[PDB]
RNA sequence: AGCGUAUAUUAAAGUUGCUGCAGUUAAAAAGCUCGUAGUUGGAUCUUGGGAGCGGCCGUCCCCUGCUCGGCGCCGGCCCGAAGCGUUUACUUUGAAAAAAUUAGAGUGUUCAAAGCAGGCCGCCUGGAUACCGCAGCUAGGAAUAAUGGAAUAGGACCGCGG
RNA sequence: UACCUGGUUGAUCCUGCCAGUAGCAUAUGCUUGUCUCAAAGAUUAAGCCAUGCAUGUCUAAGUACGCACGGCCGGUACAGUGAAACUGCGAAUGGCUCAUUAAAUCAGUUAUGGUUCCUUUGGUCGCUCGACUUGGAUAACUGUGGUAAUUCUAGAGCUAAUACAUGCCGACGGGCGCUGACCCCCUUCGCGGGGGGGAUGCGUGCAUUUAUCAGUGGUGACUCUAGAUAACCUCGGGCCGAUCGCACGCCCGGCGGCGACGACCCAUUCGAACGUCUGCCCUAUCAACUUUCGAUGGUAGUCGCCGUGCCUACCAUGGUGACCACGGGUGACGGGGAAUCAGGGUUCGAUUCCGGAGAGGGAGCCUGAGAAACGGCUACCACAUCCAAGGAAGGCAGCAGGCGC
């Protein structure tokens, strides 16, 4: 090409959108924004496919152009706006609040929260930076700058921000025995307690994490997001609490529930 | 136009590359500024990303720094003496980064004199008739003289700088690319550099 | 002894004409647990591309070869030997890839056959992208 | 409701032979010896116990040493951790690896090829998983195969003289 | 499903090939009732194209005095709808084809601590000590024309801006670094010695360029990010709001929210670009190749968005090869993949997803964040359309379709 691309073919689209093959040729190329294009979920896909309020692109346009949807306490009338990990989608008229967090599998969960919980979010810090006159800056995972942070917060800590003011309330420090969700790799959406961090000068540091049932799994430090102190989640977790039971167990649970149901 | 790329020339071994695509824009090349000594002339160039790049075509003044005692003053360039890269760039007296130029000694002399309460340049016997320099070298109050006498303790300049000041042209090296930024910022040659360059120009002299 | 070329050879970091009344040296530890050698700290050469005492930063790959030739100046040819696995015939074939590598004047007495560790840095020349970080002398060479 | 011909290609072709062919006479061993790259190279260095559960049997553990708080007890022992440890090939684990395709779990598209849907008298589900040689990265193993260490001792250790 | 069968002899046992046998995908022959899926001008000519379409664009929020419609009491500029036109943006994506191209493209792995980035998103936007709104043109529109000719346009009169320019006030009272008149105090009899204030002048913020000094936060590693000092500031000019819309308020002429648009810098996103390690088909009737017109290094620059022989100047004599370089062929775009298969394997991959290249053949450039752009321009070769004979307009490997093959 001779410039930035604008189309996204339906086959080349990120898989965890769970797009069918025979509907169309193109997929909603997510508008540039806070989250990455492969790690986002466009407002059109979340609104029409998961909740199934809208039936088509026109209905998604009509639902959002009435200023109804509000991503992180700020109104967004953009259908391809990238709503990503740790966001508070607040549909006001139905009186529902959704938080985008990874299901036990590699996909986003339709996870409803309470309006008291829908007033903060849990941001990971990406870089700490000294300003133009010794004014320290944070830069979080969702491309959000906060200046004059806590002098203690460092480059892999999690912060809790208020959603209107956009300022730090608390922070969870990156160390052993802290709840972490995995936000990349094959272990995408596993909730576990940090066991060991292994430094690799030049390469990517690999972090060993232990699940709630003594299941142990590693992932490179880029794909970790601490969401709790000790074993205490600071937000509500989805049904399953990021365990990933085996296909043998998932088969047993499915058919056993079916037998008892009838 | 002028292509600035690797694929037009032979490999590590000496085989011929076949060009798999025609000339691209980002593989660009513009003509050399070859900045001369005259009255100020700068042309602007719109470069990649829509930024600006200044072609100094003629330039006679520059911000030079005699950084022994931390005294920098905007100064008038007169001519070029020596150039390490090429010798014809001294004949056709072009400024390039790391040239050797003569600069007006008067702003540095003025500062040195007004600071240290001693003369510089000013050969022996020459009468100081204007006598505003008299007021700059004489008439101090009480404790200011305690300040200027503990100052002039370490007022001793080196011989090879004194020689140049007495003539009235200091040797300086251009530390800013004049073709790119549209400037002629530099520093005055001192000690080991100055001895090395005075020798190189005298070998050039013959 | 130094300053053979037209322009004045010096370390651009330090200032050497401070008014007073030996020259200090610019050098740095280069990380990855490599020892900044003694000829770098003490010596009196000027090298832009010396990874310890000059403007170049080691990042990316760290490889090892055996010294083949040392004929072009402040540069050596090392020879990296490996085995490539053909799958049809369940056998390997012996291959080699000799690459151009910057040797600092720090590593004073290096002979051919020395096991030279190199680190990747910014393109230094047309064919040169690596820089010698340490030298291991060939088995023996005591006498 | 399809069948015949023409040509490219695959198996039959163990008639291209790594698995896996032949060379006295069927086609085929240089007239002979030397010889540098290439491939291939004899034997040799760790055996051995303590302890436990079922029925002499078996299967489970233990095998270089040295700066910061709590099982703690009393500068002493244990652990925890930041730094270590001739190299590589080999094997096992882990990480990171676009979807579609193939293998494949679910699902009576009326069956099927497909499709990613659906099901229950508003609600309950799904959209899995495996493979992805070679190279690079990571952590265990130490058989096999290379390589190294004192021999005009510039040997290791131990401390004094500097 | 890990398979064989006929044919040399008068009969025999073998080597051995020819012929059968089944799939696959192009053509073709004869034949054809129903129904769900579905390839298709790739191979030869990346040959040539008549005609029609394939890229435009307005919200409550840049500029409307077209009566083109249309409210009224108009006398307090502007109701409203809205053609045109100036302005901003998009046209670099998409679509098509496979001619080039053999360490090239491309794939997996990493690097930018060696760079540029429209937009989105979040920061910054009285940090600088020195105007109740300025300036003069142009388009549409009225009017007069030229040409055989086209999305050609010259001349006249008028009028807008977030087009194009010029520029304040405020904050603003002072700090802060030098400069230093002048002054009080104490120890020595006194010189001397100790600080305290201090009129005046200069300078100041972020960004830009250079030199020097010291050592808030981060990395495996900075000549990093901040801090200090001395200066500079391109007149072909960095910033520091002469802009628009709904709301309408708060006390003696005073007197504030919610949005759109714009803007230097920083981060973020979408990327691009250039490097790292390993990997490709056939060929020796290709054994030596490269290099003073750069081949491999060194120093100094020039150019570039940055790293580099990328390009200059002066040095050095290097770099590659039997582990197949160099040259040649390819009915070669590369990969994910496809047919066949016991296990190995052989052949195919122009073809809907990712990457590359090209728009008849080569070269050069304009505008823009992004192009060496062809549904943009400028020539030159080839071809070619309309000519009142002067001139003029071209580019289907977009969708249809036509010749040719």
Tab-separated table of N, CA and C (backbone and C1' of nucleotides) in Angstrom, chain D residues 25-52:
chain	number	residue	atom	x	y	z
D	25	U	P	30.025	-58.479	-15.522
D	25	U	O5'	29.334	-59.612	-16.401
D	25	U	C5'	30.044	-60.239	-17.482
D	25	U	C4'	29.313	-61.475	-17.951
D	25	U	C3'	27.886	-61.265	-18.435
D	25	U	O3'	27.869	-60.886	-19.811
D	25	U	C1'	28.003	-63.163	-16.997
D	26	A	P	27.277	-59.463	-20.261
D	26	A	O5'	25.704	-59.660	-20.099
D	26	A	C5'	25.005	-59.289	-18.893
D	26	A	C4'	23.553	-59.002	-19.203
D	26	A	C3'	23.077	-57.565	-19.002
D	26	A	O3'	23.262	-56.741	-20.155
D	26	A	C1'	21.482	-59.139	-18.147
D	27	A	P	24.733	-56.312	-20.636
D	27	A	O5'	24.538	-54.854	-21.255
D	27	A	C5'	23.391	-54.018	-20.981
D	27	A	C4'	23.814	-52.709	-20.348
D	27	A	C3'	24.954	-52.784	-19.330
D	27	A	O3'	26.162	-52.431	-20.010
D	27	A	C1'	23.029	-51.760	-18.351
D	28	A	P	27.607	-52.867	-19.443
D	28	A	O5'	27.764	-51.985	-18.129
D	28	A	C5'	28.309	-50.653	-18.175
D	28	A	C4'	28.181	-49.993	-16.820
D	28	A	C3'	29.320	-50.258	-15.833
D	28	A	O3'	29.765	-49.065	-15.189
D	28	A	C1'	27.242	-51.065	-14.955
D	29	A	P	31.310	-48.894	-14.775
D	29	A	O5'	31.439	-49.838	-13.496
D	29	A	C5'	32.288	-51.006	-13.472
D	29	A	C4'	33.592	-50.683	-12.787
D	29	A	C3'	34.598	-51.831	-12.689
D	29	A	O3'	35.932	-51.337	-12.667
D	29	A	C1'	33.975	-51.171	-10.526
D	30	A	P	36.727	-51.084	-14.027
D	30	A	O5'	37.500	-49.723	-13.735
D	30	A	C5'	36.854	-48.595	-13.107
D	30	A	C4'	37.387	-47.308	-13.690
D	30	A	C3'	38.905	-47.257	-13.920
D	30	A	O3'	39.193	-46.752	-15.221
D	30	A	C1'	38.187	-45.305	-12.859
D	31	G	P	39.613	-47.740	-16.401
D	31	G	O5'	40.789	-48.592	-15.750
D	31	G	C5'	40.827	-50.025	-15.853
D	31	G	C4'	42.193	-50.537	-15.463
D	31	G	C3'	42.695	-50.127	-14.086
D	31	G	O3'	42.212	-51.007	-13.074
D	31	G	C1'	44.375	-49.699	-15.691
D	32	C	P	42.008	-50.482	-11.574
D	32	C	O5'	43.489	-50.134	-11.108
D	32	C	C5'	44.418	-51.163	-10.730
D	32	C	C4'	45.771	-50.566	-10.415
D	32	C	C3'	45.831	-49.639	-9.213
D	32	C	O3'	45.911	-50.384	-8.000
D	32	C	C1'	46.988	-48.650	-11.018
D	33	U	P	45.027	-49.976	-6.724
D	33	U	O5'	45.920	-48.870	-6.005
D	33	U	C5'	47.043	-49.237	-5.184
D	33	U	C4'	48.099	-48.155	-5.191
D	33	U	C3'	47.798	-46.909	-4.377
D	33	U	O3'	47.989	-47.099	-2.979
D	33	U	C1'	48.685	-46.274	-6.467
D	34	C	P	47.218	-46.169	-1.927
D	34	C	O5'	47.930	-44.755	-2.105
D	34	C	C5'	49.255	-44.531	-1.593
D	34	C	C4'	49.774	-43.180	-2.027
D	34	C	C3'	49.119	-41.970	-1.385
D	34	C	O3'	49.603	-41.734	-0.067
D	34	C	C1'	49.393	-41.588	-3.704
D	35	G	P	48.603	-41.225	1.074
D	35	G	O5'	48.083	-39.831	0.506
D	35	G	C5'	48.965	-38.706	0.319
D	35	G	C4'	48.224	-37.538	-0.293
D	35	G	C3'	46.902	-37.177	0.365
D	35	G	O3'	47.149	-36.352	1.495
D	35	G	C1'	46.592	-37.310	-1.969
D	36	U	P	46.128	-36.319	2.727
D	36	U	O5'	45.495	-34.861	2.627
D	36	U	C5'	46.325	-33.693	2.482
D	36	U	C4'	45.510	-32.507	2.020
D	36	U	C3'	44.106	-32.373	2.587
D	36	U	O3'	44.096	-31.871	3.920
D	36	U	C1'	44.049	-31.968	0.266
D	37	A	P	42.772	-31.996	4.817
D	37	A	O5'	41.794	-30.925	4.159
D	37	A	C5'	40.390	-30.914	4.474
D	37	A	C4'	39.622	-30.121	3.442
D	37	A	C3'	38.121	-30.384	3.396
D	37	A	O3'	37.373	-29.681	4.382
D	37	A	C1'	38.979	-30.568	1.221
D	38	G	P	36.519	-30.495	5.468
D	38	G	O5'	35.613	-31.459	4.578
D	38	G	C5'	34.514	-30.956	3.792
D	38	G	C4'	33.684	-32.082	3.213
D	38	G	C3'	33.289	-33.194	4.173
D	38	G	O3'	32.120	-32.816	4.894
D	38	G	C1'	34.176	-34.147	2.204
D	39	U	P	32.022	-33.053	6.477
D	39	U	O5'	31.706	-34.609	6.586
D	39	U	C5'	30.444	-35.128	6.137
D	39	U	C4'	30.550	-36.597	5.802
D	39	U	C3'	30.839	-37.531	6.964
D	39	U	O3'	29.687	-37.788	7.760
D	39	U	C1'	32.214	-38.116	5.142
D	40	U	P	29.822	-37.929	9.350
D	40	U	O5'	30.758	-39.206	9.516
D	40	U	C5'	30.300	-40.504	9.106
D	40	U	C4'	31.340	-41.563	9.386
D	40	U	C3'	31.921	-41.581	10.789
D	40	U	O3'	31.030	-42.179	11.723
D	40	U	C1'	33.658	-41.846	9.207
D	41	G	P	31.308	-42.041	13.292
D	41	G	O5'	32.579	-42.975	13.504
D	41	G	C5'	33.512	-42.725	14.566
D	41	G	C4'	34.779	-43.507	14.339
D	41	G	C3'	35.797	-43.410	15.462
D	41	G	O3'	35.502	-44.371	16.466
D	41	G	C1'	36.857	-42.906	13.417
D	42	G	P	36.003	-44.151	17.969
D	42	G	O5'	36.638	-45.562	18.338
D	42	G	C5'	36.304	-46.744	17.588
D	42	G	C4'	36.845	-47.974	18.272
D	42	G	C3'	36.782	-47.978	19.791
D	42	G	O3'	35.469	-48.326	20.225
D	42	G	C1'	38.952	-48.582	19.109
D	43	A	P	34.801	-47.575	21.474
D	43	A	O5'	35.637	-48.138	22.706
D	43	A	C5'	35.726	-49.556	22.928
D	43	A	C4'	36.669	-49.879	24.064
D	43	A	C3'	36.568	-49.011	25.312
D	43	A	O3'	35.467	-49.373	26.137
D	43	A	C1'	38.829	-49.234	24.722
D	44	U	P	34.625	-48.240	26.888
D	44	U	O5'	35.691	-47.605	27.887
D	44	U	C5'	36.322	-48.391	28.915
D	44	U	C4'	37.441	-47.613	29.570
D	44	U	C3'	37.021	-46.366	30.326
D	44	U	O3'	36.501	-46.701	31.611
D	44	U	C1'	38.931	-45.889	29.008
D	45	C	P	35.225	-45.928	32.207
D	45	C	O5'	35.885	-44.760	33.063
D	45	C	C5'	36.546	-45.022	34.314
D	45	C	C4'	36.672	-43.739	35.094
D	45	C	C3'	35.352	-43.012	35.372
D	45	C	O3'	35.251	-42.511	36.705
D	45	C	C1'	36.877	-41.549	34.334
D	46	U	P	34.802	-43.463	37.924
D	46	U	O5'	33.541	-44.251	37.348
D	46	U	C5'	32.361	-43.556	36.906
D	46	U	C4'	31.122	-44.177	37.507
D	46	U	C3'	29.809	-43.533	37.068
D	46	U	O3'	28.863	-44.484	36.533
D	46	U	C1'	30.080	-43.299	39.420
D	47	U	P	27.699	-45.204	37.408
D	47	U	O5'	28.426	-46.479	38.029
D	47	U	C5'	27.670	-47.553	38.639
D	47	U	C4'	28.529	-48.276	39.652
D	47	U	C3'	27.832	-48.818	40.897
D	47	U	O3'	27.260	-50.115	40.758
D	47	U	C1'	29.682	-47.535	41.563
D	48	G	P	26.118	-50.621	41.781
D	48	G	O5'	26.461	-49.869	43.146
D	48	G	C5'	27.156	-50.524	44.231
D	48	G	C4'	27.279	-49.616	45.440
D	48	G	C3'	26.076	-49.592	46.370
D	48	G	O3'	26.100	-50.730	47.229
D	48	G	C1'	26.796	-47.373	45.963
D	49	G	P	24.753	-51.274	47.913
D	49	G	O5'	24.770	-50.558	49.336
D	49	G	C5'	23.561	-50.284	50.069
D	49	G	C4'	23.760	-49.050	50.913
D	49	G	C3'	22.572	-48.602	51.752
D	49	G	O3'	22.529	-49.321	52.984
D	49	G	C1'	23.356	-46.770	50.507
D	50	G	P	21.124	-49.739	53.642
D	50	G	O5'	20.587	-48.365	54.243
D	50	G	C5'	21.321	-47.664	55.264
D	50	G	C4'	20.665	-46.339	55.583
D	50	G	C3'	19.164	-46.382	55.827
D	50	G	O3'	18.874	-46.767	57.169
D	50	G	C1'	19.656	-44.647	54.301
D	51	A	P	17.816	-47.935	57.469
D	51	A	O5'	16.422	-47.258	57.102
D	51	A	C5'	15.939	-46.119	57.839
D	51	A	C4'	14.979	-45.307	57.001
D	51	A	C3'	13.745	-46.038	56.490
D	51	A	O3'	12.772	-46.149	57.526
D	51	A	C1'	14.693	-44.786	54.729
D	52	G	P	11.952	-47.514	57.745
D	52	G	O5'	10.650	-47.290	56.856
D	52	G	C5'	9.750	-46.200	57.138
D	52	G	C4'	8.899	-45.892	55.930
D	52	G	C3'	7.888	-46.957	55.545
D	52	G	O3'	6.727	-46.835	56.364
D	52	G	C1'	8.989	-46.116	53.605
